[PDB]
């Protein structure tokens, strides 16, 4: 872990580390576990420097929380875009008076969550329309500031 | 549709053709004045170096233009870069010097 | 003629001391200054170390940028080179030595 | 620091959200969070944007085991020993 006394947490992150010194309910357990499943389990093939872009590890945690963050991951990943797409977008919006270019190097761990479904935007804008609620005050600016 | 794709890992940078071919900064190109004007900075930055000491030659299409002369003594070294450097650098989407 | 013209000279030397100048590959670099000073300081008696301008190897994709050189060897001489990016998995751009 | 914005790695401040640059003139324009204290020549991003990306370097667990009634019992083994060194026993 980060910070000082990283080795302080090992004892809690990996049960199997403590041997089986005495005869205790705790040890009876540790004795029951398998040695080989602890620490780093599998890692990414791609890497920057001598560090891997991602890794799979065994360690204390709870299936629920893990499972949640699992879906949260997915959801974001699905929202990915790549600069090339941005080039097309901004350029097309301009109606052809300028042309945008977004240079970039090759990478797969470049997260840019911005893509969504029209459905979502509609739902969202219905909320906006309801917000007005006949209060000129809310519109007054939009119209003016645009003019 | 001309655009430029930077070089990487030693490779050369390349600008896009008019037919969609991408060439390196060398050879004989043809630029309509306007095209440069609308990108003075970016171009001067990317090409000047190759024009001066490299192997790139550009033909800017102008049609008509005002000119100014600078005479020199033939027996002594004379390099016109400083003169043309200024020209290129002072080109704008609104002006050009003699 | 050597600098901006098309004259290239091979100086026969036999053996000679050399000196290295490493530079960042992704930035302009013109070795004329060094190779000038070398020529300038040759003498019926002296001859300073030959200066070479070499690129810094890299363990990752990098942009490229022009580099003007004037002095190269005529046979392998980088034998003193022990290892590039020694602490990394592999060299992506530039001289790769294991 | 800058080139990092293109993917090229360290061979700009994270404060940057938008880095624009024109080709016909020398006048770049960058956007920063309106919540910053140094709008020095920087443009702003007013939108009330949600923080999606967040990181946790800790443990991915939400349950913790606690002691309700303490206790201390005698044991045959008191610690691990190596040459002259001796490490204590830490249970999970």
């Amino acid at each position: 872990l980060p910070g000082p006394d990283a080795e302080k947490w090992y004892s809690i992150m990996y049960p199997t580390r403590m041997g089986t010194p005495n005869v205790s309910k705790i040890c009876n357990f540790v004795a029951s576990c398998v040695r080989n499943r602890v620490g780093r389990f599998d890692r990414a093939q791609m890497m920057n420097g001598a560090m891997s872009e991602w890794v799979d590890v065994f360690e204390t945690s709870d299936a629920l929380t893990v499972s949640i963050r699992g879906r949260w991951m997915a959801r974001l990943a699905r929202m990915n875009i790549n600069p090339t797409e941005i080039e097309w977008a901004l350029t097309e919006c301009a109606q052809g008076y300028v042309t945008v270019t977004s240079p970039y190097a090759p990478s797969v761990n470049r997260l840019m969550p911005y893509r969504i479904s029209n459905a979502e935007r509609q739902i969202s804008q219905i909320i906006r329309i309801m917000n007005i609620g006949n209060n000129a005050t809310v519109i007054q600016p939009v119209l003016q500031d645009i003019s | 549709d001309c655009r430029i794709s930077f070089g990487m890992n030693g490779a050369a940078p390349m600008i896009r053709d008019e037919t969609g071919m991408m060439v390196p900064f060398e050879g004989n190109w043809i630029f309509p004045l306007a095209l440069w004007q609308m990108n003075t900075r970016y171009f001067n930055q990317q090409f000047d170096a190759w024009i001066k000491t490299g192997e790139l030659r550009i033909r800017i299409e102008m049609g008509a233009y005002p000119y100014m002369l600078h005479y020199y003594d033939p027996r002594q070294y004379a390099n016109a870069w400083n003169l043309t450097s200024a020209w290129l650098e002072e080109i704008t989407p609104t002006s050009i010097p003699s | 003629w050597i600098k901006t013209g098309e004259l290239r000279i091979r100086i026969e030397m036999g053996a000679y001391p050399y000196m290295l100048h490493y530079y960042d590959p992704r930035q302009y670099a013109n070795a004329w200054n060094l190779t000038s000073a070398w020529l300038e300081e040759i003498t019926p008696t002296s001859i300073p170390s030959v200066p070479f301008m070499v690129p810094i190897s890299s363990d990752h994709d990098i942009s490229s940028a022009p580099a003007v050189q004037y002095i190269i060897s005529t046979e392998y001489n980088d034998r003193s080179l022990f290892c590039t990016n020694s602490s990394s998995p592999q060299t992506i751009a530039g001289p790769d030595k294991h | 620091a800058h080139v990092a914005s293109h993917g090229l790695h360290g061979n700009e401040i994270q404060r940057h959200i938008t880095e624009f640059i024109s080709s016909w003139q020398n006048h770049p324009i960058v956007q920063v969070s309106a919540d910053v204290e140094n709008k020095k020549t920087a443009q702003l991003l007013h939108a009330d944007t949600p923080r999606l990306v967040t990181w946790d370097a800790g443990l991915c667990t939400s349950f913790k085991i606690v002691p309700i009634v303490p206790a201390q019992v005698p044991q045959d083994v008191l610690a691990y020993t190596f040459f002259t060194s001796s490490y204590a026993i830490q249970s999970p």
Binding site: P2, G3 | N44, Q45, Q46, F47, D48, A49, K52, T53, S85, A86, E89, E90 | H21, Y23, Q27, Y28, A29, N30, A31, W32, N33, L34, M53 | N26, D35, R51, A57
Partner: peptide
Amino acid sequence: MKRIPRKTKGKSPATTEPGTSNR
């Protein structure tokens, strides 16, 4: 570790390049 403060309240060799001259 880094830290991003909340905006809300919670539960609590010549190098002089040939084209860089400003005009």
